[PDB]
Design an enzyme around this catalytic site. Structure first.
Site, PDB file in Angstrom:
ATOM      1  N   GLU A 156      43.554  39.058 -24.069  1.00 19.88           N
ATOM      2  CA  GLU A 156      44.167  37.923 -24.783  1.00 19.88           C
ATOM      3  C   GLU A 156      43.266  36.686 -24.778  1.00 19.88           C
ATOM      4  O   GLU A 156      43.147  36.009 -25.804  1.00 19.88           O
ATOM      5  CB  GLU A 156      45.543  37.562 -24.216  1.00 19.88           C
ATOM      6  CG  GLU A 156      46.686  38.546 -24.506  1.00 19.88           C
ATOM      7  CD  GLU A 156      46.664  39.122 -25.920  1.00 19.88           C
ATOM      8  OE1 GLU A 156      47.123  38.472 -26.903  1.00 19.88           O
ATOM      9  OE2 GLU A 156      46.190  40.250 -26.034  1.00 19.88           O
ATOM     10  N   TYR A 207      42.249  48.783 -25.766  1.00 22.37           N
ATOM     11  CA  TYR A 207      43.359  49.079 -24.843  1.00 22.37           C
ATOM     12  C   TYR A 207      44.609  48.197 -25.045  1.00 22.37           C
ATOM     13  O   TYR A 207      45.659  48.455 -24.462  1.00 22.37           O
ATOM     14  CB  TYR A 207      42.879  49.067 -23.371  1.00 22.37           C
ATOM     15  CG  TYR A 207      43.628  50.061 -22.506  1.00 22.37           C
ATOM     16  CD1 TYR A 207      43.369  51.429 -22.605  1.00 22.37           C
ATOM     17  CD2 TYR A 207      44.619  49.639 -21.604  1.00 22.37           C
ATOM     18  CE1 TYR A 207      44.054  52.350 -21.826  1.00 22.37           C
ATOM     19  CE2 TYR A 207      45.333  50.571 -20.827  1.00 22.37           C
ATOM     20  CZ  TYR A 207      45.037  51.920 -20.942  1.00 22.37           C
ATOM     21  OH  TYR A 207      45.707  52.867 -20.182  1.00 22.37           O
ATOM     22  N   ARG A 208      44.496  47.157 -25.878  1.00 24.21           N
ATOM     23  CA  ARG A 208      45.574  46.190 -26.054  1.00 24.21           C
ATOM     24  C   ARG A 208      46.881  46.842 -26.482  1.00 24.21           C
ATOM     25  O   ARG A 208      47.920  46.541 -25.925  1.00 24.21           O
ATOM     26  CB  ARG A 208      45.198  45.099 -27.058  1.00 24.21           C
ATOM     27  CG  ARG A 208      46.164  43.911 -27.036  1.00 24.21           C
ATOM     28  CD  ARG A 208      45.859  42.929 -28.171  1.00 24.21           C
ATOM     29  NE  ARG A 208      46.741  41.760 -28.121  1.00 24.21           N
ATOM     30  CZ  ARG A 208      47.872  41.616 -28.806  1.00 24.21           C
ATOM     31  NH1 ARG A 208      48.305  42.565 -29.640  1.00 24.21           N
ATOM     32  NH2 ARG A 208      48.581  40.500 -28.663  1.00 24.21           N
ATOM     33  N   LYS A 209      46.829  47.730 -27.471  1.00 27.10           N
ATOM     34  CA  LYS A 209      48.062  48.337 -27.986  1.00 27.10           C
ATOM     35  C   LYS A 209      48.813  49.107 -26.895  1.00 27.10           C
ATOM     36  O   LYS A 209      50.041  49.048 -26.826  1.00 27.10           O
ATOM     37  CB  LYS A 209      47.765  49.255 -29.188  1.00 27.10           C
ATOM     38  CG  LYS A 209      49.002  49.845 -29.856  1.00 27.10           C
ATOM     39  CD  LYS A 209      48.589  50.812 -30.982  1.00 27.10           C
ATOM     40  CE  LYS A 209      49.797  51.302 -31.806  1.00 27.10           C
ATOM     41  NZ  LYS A 209      49.347  52.156 -32.981  1.00 27.10           N
ATOM     42  N   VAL A 248      50.491  46.368 -24.569  1.00 20.53           N
ATOM     43  CA  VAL A 248      51.534  45.492 -25.135  1.00 20.53           C
ATOM     44  C   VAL A 248      52.618  46.209 -25.940  1.00 20.53           C
ATOM     45  O   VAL A 248      53.735  45.702 -26.069  1.00 20.53           O
ATOM     46  CB  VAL A 248      50.938  44.330 -25.976  1.00 20.53           C
ATOM     47  CG1 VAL A 248      49.852  43.605 -25.176  1.00 20.53           C
ATOM     48  CG2 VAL A 248      50.404  44.832 -27.298  1.00 20.53           C
TER      49      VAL A 248
END
Lengths: 143, 143
Positions: free
Chosen positions: A47, A95-97, A100
């Site tokens: 982020e 890796y964000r998906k 979150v």
């Protein structure tokens, strides 16, 4: 000419560095509690990069990103970070998906290996941003 | 009549109960690692509630929400949770923006107090969902 949210960026860089320092600390990531903390660190690192990237792009009238995934490519084009740094940071961002949205699938061991593999590019990210800020805006001002 | 994503809901409730059980432990949430772990837990609890809410709404053809607050309000309207449970959960959901967007402002002490104050409503949430599923769909089928 450029109106850059320099306070926000430099704030978030400090926060980023703190979380990276914590990652580099002597924990038990394999704990329950350790797994959860590492997921939060991963999320925060990502982020901070995306938010800083957006602020850079908006402030310096860079090409507008279609999606958060385009951000690094633009920073590379603008010579904020190296091509290799950009590619490396993209691999963490991917890796964000999982963190979150598909959080049932989050795998803290996987995430550990990901962050470790790109730790040098991570450490260098604030340096790249600050050098760019200093070069384009000087030592003090947001404009 | 109704095609409900019962497997997603049930697995999401299981994951939710697991994180809630990690909160109700003898853990120092004020340590640097503990603070991060609690933030992850808070984020996870909130996302489980919203996603399950959304899946319930979609499956049972309830009113379309235009807000997260609306998700809980719709669940209240449809007699899934009590009005008071709805109110209590909305207080936790109110912290989502801080956890996911304004993360420089996240305060793990504030979060601890929030989760603690509404622990019973949280513990009862899966019970409420399962009870509704059982009544509307029976003990086995998603449809």
């Amino acid at each position: 000419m450029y109106f850059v949210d320099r306070s926000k960026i430099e704030k978030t860089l400090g926060f980023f560095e703190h979380q990276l320092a914590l990652f580099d600390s002597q924990t038990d990531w394999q704990s329950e509690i350790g797994e959860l903390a590492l997921q939060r660190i991963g999320h925060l690192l990502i982020e901070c990069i995306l938010d800083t990237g957006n602020d850079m792009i908006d402030g310096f009238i860079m090409r507008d990103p279609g999606s958060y995934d385009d951000i690094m490519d633009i920073l590379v084009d603008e010579k904020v970070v190296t091509e290799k740094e950009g590619d490396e940071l993209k691999k963490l961002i991917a890796y964000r998906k999982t963190l979150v949205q598909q959080y049932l699938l989050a795998d803290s061991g996987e995430l550990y290996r990901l962050i470790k593999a790109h730790q040098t590019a991570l450490q260098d990210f604030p340096k790249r941003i600050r050098s760019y800020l200093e070069t384009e805006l000087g030592p003090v001002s947001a404009f």
